[PDB]
């Protein structure tokens, strides 16, 4: 019966800090859900910015024969489009890893 | 013919704005369908994961499991078709 | 915090009287009700700023 | 011999009781159940006796 006393104290300690590990795991799962929600909101906002920039450029490029002009804003818009493409792809990679 | 040509273009433009509004609403409806099918996959696969923790003879090749495999395959085909519809829209 | 404290408190109970009484099911309902309440408060907070 | 057969039925009873608890918790699992999460490859993974 002292062997039984040994075994019950041993198993009770196993129970107890299994319980502690379970509590920490649940709290970290909560914060993981909140982070992936933030990632999805960011992706749809960057999609909106891409909409705006590319609409501006295609509305601009219908200009008449004399005023087809290579201003600084055209080059800035092209750079902005590929910058937000890189941003969007990085956000999808982080979403898959999370 | 400038006046009635301009009126024809004006009618075309007004109805085009109407139809684009309906297509945008269609896009949002396909998005809502996609996210609810994702939640249904979550429920079915969590149930299938928890079910296989049984004791030794209780691991049973039940018609429930032979149906849950077709559940996961059918919801996979559903979400694939709805993604295709989103690209087409 | 008080619901999780009472749930962990009722696990010190000695093995004859370690019970699933009327208190346990109502505390489980309390925990789920509190979490549902504060999650829905978070979602209406999200609606407000939009 | 009677003690032997009684113990065999008692261990089978323990197995049925634990499997009953598992299938009960699987049965009441609805959507919005606050216990679900994704699982990958479970559609192929099985041990089956």
């Amino acid at each position: 019966n002292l062997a039984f006393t040994n075994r019950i104290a041993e198993t009770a300690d196993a129970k107890n800090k299994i319980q502690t590990h379970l509590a920490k795991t649940l709290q970290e799962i909560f914060q993981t859900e909140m982070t992936i929600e933030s990632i999805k909101k960011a992706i749809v906002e960057k999609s909106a910015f891409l909409k705006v920039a590319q609409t501006r450029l295609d509305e601009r490029t219908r200009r008449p024969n004399i005023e087809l002009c290579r201003d600084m804003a055209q080059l800035r818009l092209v750079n902005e489009v590929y910058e937000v493409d890189d941003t969007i792809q990085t956000l999808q990679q982080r979403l898959r890893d999370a | 013919e400038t006046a009635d040509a301009k009126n024809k273009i004006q009618t075309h433009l007004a109805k085009t704005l109407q139809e684009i509004f309906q297509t945008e609403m269609t896009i949002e409806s396909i998005k809502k369908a996609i996210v609810e099918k994702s939640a249904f996959l979550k429920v079915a696969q969590t149930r299938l994961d928890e079910r296989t923790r049984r004791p030794n003879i209780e691991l049973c090749r039940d018609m429930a499991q032979l149906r849950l495999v077709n559940e996961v395959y059918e919801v996979d085909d559903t979400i694939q078709t709805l993604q295709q519809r989103l690209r087409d829209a | 915090s008080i619901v999780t404290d009472n749930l962990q408190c009722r696990e010190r109970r000695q093995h004859p009287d370690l019970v699933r009484d009327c208190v346990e099911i109502e505390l489980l309902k309390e925990a789920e009700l509190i979490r549902n309440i504060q999650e829905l408060l978070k979602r209406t907070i999200k609606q407000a700023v939009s | 011999a009677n003690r032997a057969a009684q113990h065999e039925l008692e261990k089978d009873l323990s197995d049925k009781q634990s499997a009953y608890r598992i299938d009960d918790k699987c049965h009441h699992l609805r959507n919005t159940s606050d216990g679900v999460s994704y699982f990958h490859g479970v559609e192929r993974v099985d041990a089956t006796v």
């Binding site: - | 609810e36 429920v43 | 489980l28 925990a31 789920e32 999650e39 | 216990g35 679900v36």
Partner: peptide, 17 residues
Amino acid sequence: GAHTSSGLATSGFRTAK
């Protein structure tokens, strides 16, 4: 409304009795 899209992973745990 009804939280039909979000599922957290936890409950107030007691196993079997």
